[PDB]
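Task: sequence design from structure.
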């Protein structure tokens, strides 16, 4: 029953346009800020190596009940063992190999399960893993890991999320932030929110199955917030934004029915997603994947 929102802009910059990220994002701004989110595909030869300490990478993911709002209010893993769990869950759920499940089917099933009161689906998300714990997905000239000569251009690239500017201009900065990692599985999700201080954010999918995004342009931010408070459970209606944002899951078609412009995209491995200032966004993972994200300043 789910109607996919229209696709957000996708940019395939040339090698010349790929020289500086902030310069490129500034040039695409007239279009991309009207959609809230956009996708950027690097040149096909731009392939950074995965530089996390895989042997020691261990985490305890958080548990997500898809229908918790409809129902209630209304293990330690390695990267390998989490991937085995994630692939087994998806192949068992859809009764087919994980790479044969259409992205439109996972999308339709996700939003059906969020509002379903008869079926309780529970997944796990390896979220808010600091790049300091096991290293960034990008190579970094930190001295803690070896960098091959062919990898040094990626350690120095402006599209390396560790090299994005993160310092905001202020007077307090004169009288006086690292990327985070996300290990996803099928149906693991993030609800509608904006970044702190209305900041930009950039997201890179290092590997795995796609991450599905939904975005709302900043000019409709107040409209989305009014629809939320109208339709979010009245028990949470008076909560501050910073807390309400923890339980603001909502079908994009419901927002679209109330006149809120929503755009979608499937972020595939090796592709960037940029969220613009005060652009509400949400999404879910199609399967086992690994993403890295950071807020940056212009
Ligand atoms: C509001 C998010 S959440 O309540 O749904 N939640 C679960 C999902 C994982 N994680 C996230 C994920 C996320 N973006 C998607 C990145 C990706 O998955 O690749 N942004 C934030 C966030 C929180 C406060 C201020 C700014 N950002 N937290 C923890 C919290
Ligand atoms: Mn966020």
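Answer:
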């Amino acid at each position: 029953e789910f109607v996919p929102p229209p696709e957000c802009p996708v940019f395939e910059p040339s090698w010349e346009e790929f020289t500086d990220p902030l310069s490129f994002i500034g040039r695409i701004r007239p279009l991309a800020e009207k959609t809230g989110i956009c996708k950027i595909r690097p040149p096909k030869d731009w392939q950074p190596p995965f530089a996390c300490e895989v042997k020691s990478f261990r985490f305890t993911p958080r548990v997500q009940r898809l229908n918790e709002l409809e129902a209630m209010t209304r293990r330690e893993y390695t990267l390998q063992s989490f991937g085995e769990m994630a692939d087994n869950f998806k192949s068992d759920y859809f009764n087919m190999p994980v790479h044969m499940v259409p992205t439109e089917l996972v999308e339709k099933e996700f939003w059906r399960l969020v509002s379903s009161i008869e079926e309780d689906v529970i997944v796990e998300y390896g979220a808010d893993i600091s790049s300091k714990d096991f290293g960034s997905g990008f190579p970094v000239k930190d001295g803690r890991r070896k960098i091959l000569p062919e990898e040094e251009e990626y350690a120095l690239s402006g599209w390396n999320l560790n090299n994005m500017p993160v310092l905001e201009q202020s007077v307090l900065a004169h009288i006086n932030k690292v990327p985070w990692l996300y290990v996803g599985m099928c149906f693991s999700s993030f609800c509608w929110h904006i970044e702190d201080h209305w900041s930009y954010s950039i997201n890179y999918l290092h590997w795995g199955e796609p991450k599905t995004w939904y975005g709302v342009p900043s000019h409709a931010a107040e409209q989305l917030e009014e629809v939320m408070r109208e339709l979010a459970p009245e028990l949470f209606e008076s909560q501050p934004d910073l807390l309400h944002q923890l339980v603001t899951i909502m079908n994009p078609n419901v927002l679209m029915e109330h006149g809120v412009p929503v755009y979608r995209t499937n972020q595939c491995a090796g592709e960037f997603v940029v969220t613009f200032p005060r652009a509400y966004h949400s999404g879910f993972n199609q399967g086992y994947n690994f993403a890295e994200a950071v807020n940056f300043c212009t």
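The CA atoms of residues 139 and 148 lie 9 Å apart.
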